[PDB]
Design a protein around this ligand. Structure first.
Ligand SMILES: NC(=O)c1ccc[n+]([C@@H]2O[C@H](COP(=O)([O-])OP(=O)(O)OC[C@@H]3O[C@@H](n4cnc5c(N)ncnc54)[C@H](OP(=O)(O)O)[C@@H]3O)[C@@H](O)[C@H]2O)c1
Ligand SMILES: NC(=O)c1ccc[n+]([C@@H]2O[C@H](COP(=O)([O-])OP(=O)(O)OC[C@@H]3O[C@@H](n4cnc5c(N)ncnc54)[C@H](OP(=O)(O)O)[C@@H]3O)[C@@H](O)[C@H]2O)c1
Lengths: 307, 307
């Protein structure tokens, strides 16, 4: 497999690089950064080679600037983590427009070289995925974003802890915006396969407290972080696993009254990327909240669309 | 951990012995058989020691006849696999009474030595678990049987195959008798956490064909067999995992209109054995079928109770 990471010089990009390099299916790993980052990337490559020393890995690591993307040709997946993180003093719209220009430029440049899958990590992820889809002109199954995948895993841990059951027995998910308008799907939450609604303890679940925790600490490491979540999706693709993850994907009516937007939703993932957006009936409160979330995201998409 | 297997000279007993010996938590493994089986058991112990050669395992393997069970003292769990298998030409009642005398004698002899947990594998498992509970006079959380645990795993594989999703995304179970009166719990079957009823494909699920397969091939190896299923439960106990498996356990009203019988049911398993029988509302057809199944089992229990 060949993977390119644009934004490898950053925190999440460098962590992801280290994890991917250790994978048996990894053949060619391309690390892209701006010209002023080459020295740092060369340092990262040496660190990776040291970590791989002793093993029989035959993976090649490349370091290149973003001036000429010829090197990304034939990549199975291109991960974009370039972008300015949560600014201490700025609005989400300024963040959206600022990163829209970064992700959009890379999406357009990638498409000039080859057809491939784009995995967007830069925030606001749902909006950046949409912008990447628009500027690349790729098919809807080829562009997606981390979305609420890690948020849903965090929620899983919280529920398992509350019921006192093994983590494996809990399957849940959060859809919508990877932000304050996320929607926990209690109608699609099972414990040992049993609907969570069928437990008397469900009545005492601190849903509000738990969600508050996911909204503010959702991108933090779980005592497993963003890097591990990204590897999870990459493995699902190269191994054609067919899992029903929750990622930022393009929707066009799968959920009545929701179209022309990218937003966290259940999808079946495989070697062909988003092989399908799984549409199911939601409960009254969930659909209302989901529409609300989609409306918030649609506004940002409309504002960065032409940038 | 210390485990005793009574019936280790048999097919499932010997396979289980081999698997358990390789576990890191295994300290003392006791193999019990009738006097005429000692040579075969000594041969099995040599085979196990050969398999363990090269590793740094510090497990001790003991071979003893069933004349003096002093050796089982302090066992964390005693697995009983002794019994006559499905006779080519005989009724289930004859099988029940015949094995009732075997399992019951061992349950009584074990209780004379120490208090411990008894894991019953001999068929009819639901009836043999009940007989072991009655003759040992142990608490209801200390005696249980494999039940429909492996049947439920087989059902899981069939459903995952039909929907074309990763095995991990499917959680289901079958309750009732480990026999022809088993009851698949579609109301407690989720795909990616989503109720199976919410999929359009659910309408075309060959439930009848699949169940027929589980009823006749349920004890066969899955391309994972009985031995692996037993290790699964043992690991759940020693590691206090808190999984919601489906085992043969004593029920006393957890499911309205069902008591004084051992039958496959959802239970939370931990270091203390059956820490609780999970009672939940079943759909109309499931409860009717479950009561039917319990009535069939109750008849056998009443007939072997005093043996
Ligand atoms: N969804 C999630 O779970 C999640 C988690 C963590 C982070 N993120 C997001 O992903 C992005 C990166 O996070 P981070 O913590 O890794 O930040 P960061 O490490 O401090 O830096 C990211 C890095 O951003 C690139 N960059 C910055 N401005 C650029 C520009 N104008 N043009 C091209 N590249 C530019 C950098 O390139 P140079 O070094 O070349 O300047 C560098 O690769 C952020 O938008 C953040 O919100 C999302
Ligand atoms: N629930 C499941 O998934 C499952 C799967 C497989 C088997 N089983 C059940 O477990 C039992 C064993 O199966 P199997 O295939 O292992 O049969 P088997 O191998 O051919 O023999 C079992 C062995 O049974 C013992 N035994 C037989 N008659 C005995 C008696 N009168 N007193 C004491 N021990 C006696 C044997 O002792 P000696 O060698 O000392 O004579 C020996 O340990 C059967 O009842 C079978 O139905 C259940």
């Amino acid at each position: 497999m060949k993977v390119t990471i644009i934004g490898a010089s950053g925190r999440v990009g460098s962590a992801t690089a280290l994890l991917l390099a250790k994978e048996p299916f990894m053949k060619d790993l391309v690390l892209i950064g701006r010209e002023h980052s080459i020295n740092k990337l060369e340092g990262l490559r040496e660190d990776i080679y040291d970590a791989l020393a002793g093993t029989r890995s035959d993976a090649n690591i490349y370091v290149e600037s973003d001036e000429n993307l010829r090197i990304i040709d034939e990549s199975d997946v291109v991960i974009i983590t370039s972008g300015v993180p949560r600014k201490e003093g700025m609005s989400r719209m300024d963040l959206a427009k600022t990163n829209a220009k970064i992700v959009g430029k890379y999406a357009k440049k990638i498409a000039e070289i080859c057809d491939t899958k784009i995995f967007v990590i830069t925030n606001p992820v749902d909006v950046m995925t949409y912008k990447a889809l628009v500027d690349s002109k790729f098919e809807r199954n080829q562009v997606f974003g981390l979305g609420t995948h890690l948020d849903s895993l965090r929620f899983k841990v919280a529920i398992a802890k509350f019921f006192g059951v093994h983590i494996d027995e809990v399957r849940t998910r959060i859809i919508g915006e990877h932000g304050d308008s996320m929607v926990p799907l209690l109608s699609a939450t099972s414990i040992g396969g049993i609907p969570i609604q069928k437990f008397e303890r469900f009545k005492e679940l601190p849903i509000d407290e738990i969600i508050e925790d996911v909204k503010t600490k959702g991108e933090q490491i779980i005592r497993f972080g963003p890097a591990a979540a990204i590897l999870n999706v990459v493995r699902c693709i190269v191994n054609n696993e067919k899992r029903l993850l929750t990622l930022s994907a393009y929707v066009d009516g799968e959920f009545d009254g929701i179209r022309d937007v990218c937003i966290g939703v259940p999808v079946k993932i495989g070697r062909d990327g988003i092989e399908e957006v799984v549409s199911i009936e939601l409960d009254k409160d969930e659909i209302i909240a989901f529409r609300k979330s989609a409306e918030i995201i649609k506004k940002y998409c409309e504002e960065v669309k032409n940038l």
